[PDB]
Ligand binder design. Structure first.
Ligand SMILES: CCc1nnc2scc(-c3ccccc3)n12
Length: 127
């Protein structure tokens, strides 16, 4: 069995910014979700080999996880906040697409997404 390469976290030719919205997405949004008791399945790419999910990457063609997002934020990968917000939403959507309602992992995603939405609701105006 085989995992795909992980999502890109480094691309020197991609133009970058460090903005107050992106700083909020690291210091508030990612940090809030990362410390949560349900974060652990989301803190790195899905290891479909060790988890015995051989169809995971047959179904999920845009993988995303908070380990990737953390690296992207810490390494200033993004131009704008929307790119990072999209990564979070991709991560939640993947979980809901792959799994069944009420599965433990879906409940975990829902708890993280509730906090994501609460924090994103107060994304600061760009300075
Ligand atoms: C985002 C994780 C995930 N998404 N779909 C499934 S079925 C099982 C898991 C899982 C549970 C614990 C640890 C690692 C993976 N997942």
């Amino acid at each position: 069995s085989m995992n795909p390469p992980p999502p890109e976290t480094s691309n020197p030719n991609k133009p970058k910014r460090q903005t107050n919205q992106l700083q909020y997405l690291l210091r508030v949004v990612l940090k809030t979700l990362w410390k949560h008791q349900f974060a652990w399945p989301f803190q790195q790419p899905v290891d479909a080999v060790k988890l015995n999910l051989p169809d995971y990457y047959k179904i999920i063609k845009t993988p995303m996880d908070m380990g990737t997002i953390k690296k992207r934020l810490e390494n200033n990968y993004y131009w704008n906040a929307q790119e990072c917000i999209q990564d979070f939403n991709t991560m939640f959507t993947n979980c809901y697409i792959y799994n069944k309602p009420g599965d433990d992992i879906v409940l975990m995603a829902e708890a993280l997404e509730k906090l994501f939405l609460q924090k994103i609701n107060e994304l600061p105006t760009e300075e």
